[PDB]
PDB file of C-alpha atoms in Angstrom:
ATOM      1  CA  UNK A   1      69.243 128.283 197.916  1.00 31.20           C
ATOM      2  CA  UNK A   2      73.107 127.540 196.831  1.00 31.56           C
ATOM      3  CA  UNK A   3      75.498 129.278 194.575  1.00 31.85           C
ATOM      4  CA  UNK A   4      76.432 127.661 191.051  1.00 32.62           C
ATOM      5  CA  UNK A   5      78.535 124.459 191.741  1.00 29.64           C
ATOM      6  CA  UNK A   6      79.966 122.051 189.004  1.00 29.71           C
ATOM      7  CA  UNK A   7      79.382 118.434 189.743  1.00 28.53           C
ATOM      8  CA  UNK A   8      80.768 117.497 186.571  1.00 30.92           C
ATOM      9  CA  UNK A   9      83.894 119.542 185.096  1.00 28.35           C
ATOM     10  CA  UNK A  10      84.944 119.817 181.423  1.00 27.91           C
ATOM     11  CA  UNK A  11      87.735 117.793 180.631  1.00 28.66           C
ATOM     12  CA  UNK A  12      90.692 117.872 177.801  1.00 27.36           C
ATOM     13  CA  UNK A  13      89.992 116.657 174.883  1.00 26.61           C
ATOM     14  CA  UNK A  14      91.818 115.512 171.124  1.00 26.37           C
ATOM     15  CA  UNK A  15      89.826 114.829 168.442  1.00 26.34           C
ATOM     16  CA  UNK A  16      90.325 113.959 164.834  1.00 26.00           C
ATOM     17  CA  UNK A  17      89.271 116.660 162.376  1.00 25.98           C
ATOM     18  CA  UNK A  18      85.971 115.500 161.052  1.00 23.63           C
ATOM     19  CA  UNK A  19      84.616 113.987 163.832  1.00 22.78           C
ATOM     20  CA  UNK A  20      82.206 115.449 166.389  1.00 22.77           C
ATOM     21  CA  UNK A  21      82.896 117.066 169.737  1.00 21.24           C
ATOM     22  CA  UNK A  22      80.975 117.125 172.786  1.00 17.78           C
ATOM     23  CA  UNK A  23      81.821 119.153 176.657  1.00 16.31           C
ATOM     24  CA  UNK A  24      79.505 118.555 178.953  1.00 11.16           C
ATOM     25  CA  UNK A  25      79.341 119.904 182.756  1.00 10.51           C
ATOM     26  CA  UNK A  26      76.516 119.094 185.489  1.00 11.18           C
ATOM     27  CA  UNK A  27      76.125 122.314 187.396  1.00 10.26           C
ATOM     28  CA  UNK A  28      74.167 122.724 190.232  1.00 13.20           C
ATOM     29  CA  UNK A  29      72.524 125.441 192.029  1.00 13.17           C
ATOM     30  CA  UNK A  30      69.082 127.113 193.127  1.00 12.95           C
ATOM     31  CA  UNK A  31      68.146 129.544 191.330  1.00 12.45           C
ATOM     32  CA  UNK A  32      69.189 127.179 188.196  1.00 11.73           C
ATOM     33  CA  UNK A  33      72.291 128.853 186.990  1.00 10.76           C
ATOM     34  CA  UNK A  34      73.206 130.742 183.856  1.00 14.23           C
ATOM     35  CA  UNK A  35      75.362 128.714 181.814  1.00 11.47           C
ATOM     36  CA  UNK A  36      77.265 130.250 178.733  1.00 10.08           C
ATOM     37  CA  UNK A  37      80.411 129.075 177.110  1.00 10.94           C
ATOM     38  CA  UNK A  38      83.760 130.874 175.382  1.00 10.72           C
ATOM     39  CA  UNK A  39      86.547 129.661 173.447  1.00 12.91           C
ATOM     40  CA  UNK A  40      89.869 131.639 174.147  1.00 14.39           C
ATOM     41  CA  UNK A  41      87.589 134.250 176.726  1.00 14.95           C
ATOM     42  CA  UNK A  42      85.501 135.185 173.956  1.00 16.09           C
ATOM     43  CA  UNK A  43      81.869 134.075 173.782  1.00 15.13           C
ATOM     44  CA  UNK A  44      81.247 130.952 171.601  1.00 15.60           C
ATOM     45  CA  UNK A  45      78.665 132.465 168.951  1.00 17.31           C
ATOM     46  CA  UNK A  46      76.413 129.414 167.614  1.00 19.68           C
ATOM     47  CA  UNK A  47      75.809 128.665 163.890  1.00 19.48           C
ATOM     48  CA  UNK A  48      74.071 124.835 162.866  1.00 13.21           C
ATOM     49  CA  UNK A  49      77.611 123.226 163.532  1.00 12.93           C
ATOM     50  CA  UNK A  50      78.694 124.809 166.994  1.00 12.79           C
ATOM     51  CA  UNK A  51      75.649 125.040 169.478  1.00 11.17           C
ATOM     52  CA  UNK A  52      74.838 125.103 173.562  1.00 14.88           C
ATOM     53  CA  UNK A  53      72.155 122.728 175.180  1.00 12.06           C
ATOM     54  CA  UNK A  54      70.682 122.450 178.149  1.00 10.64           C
ATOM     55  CA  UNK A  55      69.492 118.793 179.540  1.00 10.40           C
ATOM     56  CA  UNK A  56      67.737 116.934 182.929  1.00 14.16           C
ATOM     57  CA  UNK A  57      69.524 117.187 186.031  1.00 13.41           C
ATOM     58  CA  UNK A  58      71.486 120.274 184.921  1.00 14.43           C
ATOM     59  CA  UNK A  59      73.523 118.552 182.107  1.00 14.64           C
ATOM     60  CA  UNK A  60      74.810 121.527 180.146  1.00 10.90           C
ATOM     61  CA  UNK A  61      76.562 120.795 176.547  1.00 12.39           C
ATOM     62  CA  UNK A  62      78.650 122.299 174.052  1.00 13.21           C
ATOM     63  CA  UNK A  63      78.287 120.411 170.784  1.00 13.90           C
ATOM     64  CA  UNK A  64      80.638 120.850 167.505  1.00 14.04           C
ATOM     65  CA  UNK A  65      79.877 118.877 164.026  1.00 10.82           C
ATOM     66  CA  UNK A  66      82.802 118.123 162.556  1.00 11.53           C
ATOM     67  CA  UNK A  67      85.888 119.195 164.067  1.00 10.21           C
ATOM     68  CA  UNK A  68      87.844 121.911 162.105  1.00  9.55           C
ATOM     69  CA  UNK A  69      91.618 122.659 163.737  1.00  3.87           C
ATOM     70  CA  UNK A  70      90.515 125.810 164.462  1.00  4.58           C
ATOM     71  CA  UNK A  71      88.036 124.650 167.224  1.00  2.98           C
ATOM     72  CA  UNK A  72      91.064 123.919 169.454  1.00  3.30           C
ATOM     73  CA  UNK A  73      91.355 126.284 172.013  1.00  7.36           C
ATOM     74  CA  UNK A  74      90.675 126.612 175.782  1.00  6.90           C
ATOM     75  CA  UNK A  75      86.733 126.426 176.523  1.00  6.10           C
ATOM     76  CA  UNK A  76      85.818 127.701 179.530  1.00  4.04           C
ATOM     77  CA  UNK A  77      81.989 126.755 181.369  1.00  5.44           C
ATOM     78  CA  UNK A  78      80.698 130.278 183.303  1.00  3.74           C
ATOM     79  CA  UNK A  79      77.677 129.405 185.265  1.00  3.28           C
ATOM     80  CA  UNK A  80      76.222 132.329 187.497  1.00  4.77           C
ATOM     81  CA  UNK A  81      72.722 132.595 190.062  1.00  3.56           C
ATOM     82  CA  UNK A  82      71.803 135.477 192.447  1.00  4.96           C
ATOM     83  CA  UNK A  83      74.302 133.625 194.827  1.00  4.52           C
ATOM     84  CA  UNK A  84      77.327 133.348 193.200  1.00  4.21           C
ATOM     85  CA  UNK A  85      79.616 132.482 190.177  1.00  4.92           C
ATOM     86  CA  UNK A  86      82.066 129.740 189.403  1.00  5.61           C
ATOM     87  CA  UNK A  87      83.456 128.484 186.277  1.00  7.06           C
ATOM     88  CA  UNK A  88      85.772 126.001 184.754  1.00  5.30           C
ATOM     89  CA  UNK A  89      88.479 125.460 181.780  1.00  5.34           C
ATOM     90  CA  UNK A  90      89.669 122.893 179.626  1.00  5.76           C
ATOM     91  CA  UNK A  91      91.508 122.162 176.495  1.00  7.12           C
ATOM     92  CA  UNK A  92      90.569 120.732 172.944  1.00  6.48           C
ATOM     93  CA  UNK A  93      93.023 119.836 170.908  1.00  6.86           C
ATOM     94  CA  UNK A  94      92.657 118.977 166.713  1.00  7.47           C
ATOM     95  CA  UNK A  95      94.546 116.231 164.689  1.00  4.96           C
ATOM     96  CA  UNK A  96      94.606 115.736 161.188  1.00  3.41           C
TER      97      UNK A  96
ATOM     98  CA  UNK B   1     103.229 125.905 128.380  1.00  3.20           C
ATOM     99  CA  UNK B   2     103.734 127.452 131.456  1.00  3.78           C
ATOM    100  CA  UNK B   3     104.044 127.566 134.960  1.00  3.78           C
ATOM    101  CA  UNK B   4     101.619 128.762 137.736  1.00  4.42           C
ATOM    102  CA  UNK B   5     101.603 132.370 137.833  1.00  2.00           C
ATOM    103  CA  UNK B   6      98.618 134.431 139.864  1.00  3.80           C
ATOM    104  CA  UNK B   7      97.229 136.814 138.037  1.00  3.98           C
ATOM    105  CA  UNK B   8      94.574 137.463 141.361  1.00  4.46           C
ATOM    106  CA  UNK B   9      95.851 136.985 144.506  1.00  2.00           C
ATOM    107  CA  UNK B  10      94.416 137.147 148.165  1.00  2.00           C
ATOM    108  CA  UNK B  11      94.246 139.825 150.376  1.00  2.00           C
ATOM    109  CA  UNK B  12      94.006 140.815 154.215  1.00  2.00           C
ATOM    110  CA  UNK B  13      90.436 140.751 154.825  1.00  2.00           C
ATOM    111  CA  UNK B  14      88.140 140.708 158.531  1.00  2.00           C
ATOM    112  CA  UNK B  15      84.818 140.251 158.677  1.00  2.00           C
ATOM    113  CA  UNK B  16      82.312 140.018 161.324  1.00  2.00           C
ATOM    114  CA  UNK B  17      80.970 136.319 163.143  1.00  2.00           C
ATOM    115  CA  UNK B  18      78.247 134.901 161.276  1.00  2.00           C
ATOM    116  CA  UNK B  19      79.300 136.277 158.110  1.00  2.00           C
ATOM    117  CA  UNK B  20      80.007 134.347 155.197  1.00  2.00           C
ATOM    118  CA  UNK B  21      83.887 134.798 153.396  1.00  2.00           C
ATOM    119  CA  UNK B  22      85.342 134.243 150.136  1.00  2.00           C
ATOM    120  CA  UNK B  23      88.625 134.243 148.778  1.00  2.00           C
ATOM    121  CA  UNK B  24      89.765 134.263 145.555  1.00  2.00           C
ATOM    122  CA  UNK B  25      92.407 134.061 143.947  1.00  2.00           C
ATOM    123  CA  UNK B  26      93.015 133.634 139.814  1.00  2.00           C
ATOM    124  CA  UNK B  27      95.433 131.337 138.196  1.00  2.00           C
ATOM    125  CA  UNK B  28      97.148 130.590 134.880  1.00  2.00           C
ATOM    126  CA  UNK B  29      99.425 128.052 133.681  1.00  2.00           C
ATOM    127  CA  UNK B  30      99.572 124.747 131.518  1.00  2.00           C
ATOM    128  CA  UNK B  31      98.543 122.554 131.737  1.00  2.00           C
ATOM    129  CA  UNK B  32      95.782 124.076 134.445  1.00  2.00           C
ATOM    130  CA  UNK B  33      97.836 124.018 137.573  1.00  2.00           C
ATOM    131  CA  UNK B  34      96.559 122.026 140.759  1.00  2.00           C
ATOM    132  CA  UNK B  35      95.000 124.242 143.311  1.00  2.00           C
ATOM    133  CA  UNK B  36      95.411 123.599 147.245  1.00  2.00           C
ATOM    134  CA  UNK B  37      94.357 125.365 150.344  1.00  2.00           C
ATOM    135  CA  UNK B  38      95.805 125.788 153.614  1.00  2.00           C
ATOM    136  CA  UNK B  39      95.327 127.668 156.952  1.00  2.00           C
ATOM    137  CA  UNK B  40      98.281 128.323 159.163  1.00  2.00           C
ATOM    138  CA  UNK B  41      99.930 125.733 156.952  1.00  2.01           C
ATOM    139  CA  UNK B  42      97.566 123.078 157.516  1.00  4.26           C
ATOM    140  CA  UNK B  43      95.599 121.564 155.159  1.00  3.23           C
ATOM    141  CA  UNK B  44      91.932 123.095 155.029  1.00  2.58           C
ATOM    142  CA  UNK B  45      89.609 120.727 155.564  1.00  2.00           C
ATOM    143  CA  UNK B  46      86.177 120.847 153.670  1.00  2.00           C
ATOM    144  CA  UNK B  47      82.774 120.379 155.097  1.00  2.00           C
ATOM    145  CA  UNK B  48      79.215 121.453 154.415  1.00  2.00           C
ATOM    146  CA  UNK B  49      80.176 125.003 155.647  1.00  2.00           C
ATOM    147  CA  UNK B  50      83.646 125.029 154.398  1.00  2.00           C
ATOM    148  CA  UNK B  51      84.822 124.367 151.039  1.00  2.00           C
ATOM    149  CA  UNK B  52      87.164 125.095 147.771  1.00  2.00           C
ATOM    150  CA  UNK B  53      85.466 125.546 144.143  1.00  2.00           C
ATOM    151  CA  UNK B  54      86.806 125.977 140.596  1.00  2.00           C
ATOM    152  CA  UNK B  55      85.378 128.428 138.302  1.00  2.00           C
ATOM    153  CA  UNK B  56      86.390 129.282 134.726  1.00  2.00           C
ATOM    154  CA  UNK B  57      89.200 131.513 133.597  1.00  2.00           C
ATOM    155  CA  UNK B  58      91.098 129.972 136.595  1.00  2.00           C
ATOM    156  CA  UNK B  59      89.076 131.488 139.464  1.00  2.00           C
ATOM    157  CA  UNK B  60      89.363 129.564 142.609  1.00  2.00           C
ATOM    158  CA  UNK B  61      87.883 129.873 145.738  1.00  2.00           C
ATOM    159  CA  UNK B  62      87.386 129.320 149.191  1.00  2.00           C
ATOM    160  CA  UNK B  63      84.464 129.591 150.994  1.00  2.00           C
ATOM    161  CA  UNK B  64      83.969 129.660 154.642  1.00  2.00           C
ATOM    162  CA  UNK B  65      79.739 130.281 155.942  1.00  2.00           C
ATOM    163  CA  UNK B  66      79.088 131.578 158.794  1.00  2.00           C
ATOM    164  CA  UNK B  67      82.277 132.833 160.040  1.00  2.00           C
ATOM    165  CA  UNK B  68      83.378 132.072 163.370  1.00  2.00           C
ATOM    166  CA  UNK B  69      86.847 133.195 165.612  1.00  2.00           C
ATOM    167  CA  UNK B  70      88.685 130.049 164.469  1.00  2.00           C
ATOM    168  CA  UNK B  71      88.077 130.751 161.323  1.00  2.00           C
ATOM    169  CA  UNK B  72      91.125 133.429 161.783  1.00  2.00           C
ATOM    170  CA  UNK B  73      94.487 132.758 160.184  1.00  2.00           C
ATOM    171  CA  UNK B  74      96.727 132.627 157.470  1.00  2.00           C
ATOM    172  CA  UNK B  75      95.730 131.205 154.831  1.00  2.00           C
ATOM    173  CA  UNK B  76      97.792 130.177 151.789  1.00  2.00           C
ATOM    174  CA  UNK B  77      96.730 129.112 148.339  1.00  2.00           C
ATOM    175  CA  UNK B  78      99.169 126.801 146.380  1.00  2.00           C
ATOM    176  CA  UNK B  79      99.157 126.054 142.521  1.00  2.00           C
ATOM    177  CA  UNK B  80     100.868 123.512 141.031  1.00  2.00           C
ATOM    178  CA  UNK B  81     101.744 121.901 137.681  1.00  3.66           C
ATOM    179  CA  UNK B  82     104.734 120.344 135.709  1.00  2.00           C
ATOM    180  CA  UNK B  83     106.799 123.352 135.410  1.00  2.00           C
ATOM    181  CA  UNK B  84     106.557 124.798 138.858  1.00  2.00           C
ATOM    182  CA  UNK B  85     104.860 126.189 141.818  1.00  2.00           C
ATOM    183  CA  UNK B  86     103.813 129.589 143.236  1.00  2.00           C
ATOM    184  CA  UNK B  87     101.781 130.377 146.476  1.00  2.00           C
ATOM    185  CA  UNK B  88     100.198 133.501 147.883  1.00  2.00           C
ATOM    186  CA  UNK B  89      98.930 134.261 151.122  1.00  2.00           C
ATOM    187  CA  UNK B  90      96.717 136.784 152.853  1.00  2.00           C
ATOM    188  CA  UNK B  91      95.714 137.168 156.795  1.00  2.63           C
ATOM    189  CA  UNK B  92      91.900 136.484 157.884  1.00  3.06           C
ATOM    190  CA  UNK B  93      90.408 138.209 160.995  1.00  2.00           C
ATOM    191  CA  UNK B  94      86.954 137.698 163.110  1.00  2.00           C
ATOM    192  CA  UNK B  95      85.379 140.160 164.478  1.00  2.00           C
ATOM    193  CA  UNK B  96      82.598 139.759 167.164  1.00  2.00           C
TER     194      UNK B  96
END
């Protein structure tokens, strides 16, 4: 048993507008955590070009197709179990 | 001959994520005056899910599917042609 831990953290990020965009955390933790994501504290809400997956070894992704400047903002990675919580930030910038 | 004028112009609207928006706005001049898009006085971008048309009588639109937060903004549309310019602009809100 072990609360939600984050073995790999989001990082900042700048992309071009048009190309894709990836975060991706490794959380650990037994019961498998609860992983969700928001943009600006708000829940990201996913449509075919902004979605959440879930890979081996407790690789957790956010991806974007085709970055609009209005993705930038601060994403934030909440993962939760019957143990505890923990979560962490980071920024995406856009450029023309 | 004449220069742009808006006979339709955009308005305040805020709609709810996952919903689709159009603005529209309708133009005259002449020659037909060059149409441009911006959010937050950036350019606006298309992709598959967001993207200007031209209809007759000197409709033009913007279309945005699938709303999402980022989507938010102020958007202006600009028109164009030999004899002068004229913009409008109208606020965009997202709703969860």
């Amino acid at each position: 048993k072990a609360p939600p831990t984050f073995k790999v953290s989001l990082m900042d990020q700048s992309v071009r507008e048009g190309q894709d965009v990836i975060m991706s955390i490794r959380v650990q933790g037994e019961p498998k955590p609860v992983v969700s994501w928001l943009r600006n504290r708000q829940p990201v809400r996913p449509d075919q070009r902004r979605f959440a997956e879930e890979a081996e070894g407790g690789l957790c992704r956010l991806r974007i197709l085709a970055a609009e400047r209005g993705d930038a903002g601060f994403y934030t990675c909440k993962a939760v179990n019957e143990y505890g919580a923990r979560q962490c930030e980071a920024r995406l910038e856009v450029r023309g």
